[PDB]
Amino acid sequence: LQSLEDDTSINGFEHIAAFHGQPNWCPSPDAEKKFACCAHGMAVFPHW
Amino acid sequence: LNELHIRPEDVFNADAPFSLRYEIIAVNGTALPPSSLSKPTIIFKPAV
Numbered sequence: 462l463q464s465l466e467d468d469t470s471i472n473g474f475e476h477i478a479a480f481h482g483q484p485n486w487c488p489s490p491d492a493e494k495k496f497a498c499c500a501h502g503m504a505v506f507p508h509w
Numbered sequence: 510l511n512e513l514h515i516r517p518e519d520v521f522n523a524d525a526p527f528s529l530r531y532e533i534i535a536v537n538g539t540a541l542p543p544s545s546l547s548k549p550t551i552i553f554k555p556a557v
């Protein structure tokens with residue numbers, strides 16, 4: 462965990478965690494308004 | 510358009526000739542929204 466969190470690049474723990482927050486690429490990275498893909502209440506929540 | 514095998518007159522033609530899909534890619538990879546830039550246009554140029 463120490464090594465992973467000290468890492469900063471695309472392998473960084475910070476980015477692997479920010480998948481579930483900001484910055485946002487959801488639904489598509491190119492959109493006027495962006496959200497997070499934390500699919501809540503939908504039928505793909507356990508899958509994700 | 511020549512390798513696409515579409516003659517220039519086909520642009521004027523009442524048939525729907527084609528369109529273009531543009532997209533902007535940032536240096537760091539985070540593609541910007543297409544709204545940040547205007548709509549490209551197609552110009553014609555006759556012979557002299």
Ligand SMILES: *[C@@H]1O[C@H](CO)[C@@H](O[C@@H]2O[C@H](CO)[C@@H](O[C@@H]3O[C@H](CO)[C@@H](O)[C@H](O)[C@@H]3O)[C@H](O)[C@H]2NC(C)=O)[C@H](O)[C@H]1NC(C)=O
Nearest residue numbers: 476483484485495533534535536537538539540541542545
């Ligand atoms: C990767 O590149 C993109 C664009 O090429 C960078 O996005 C730019 O910077 C920020 C996001 O980091 C955004 O604009 C800013 O938003 C904040 C939100 O409060 C605002 O306060 C600032 O005044 C600014 O407007 C936006 O995504 C973009 N800025 C633009 C389009 O003007 C992004 O930062 C880059 N990421 C890295 C890690 O370098």
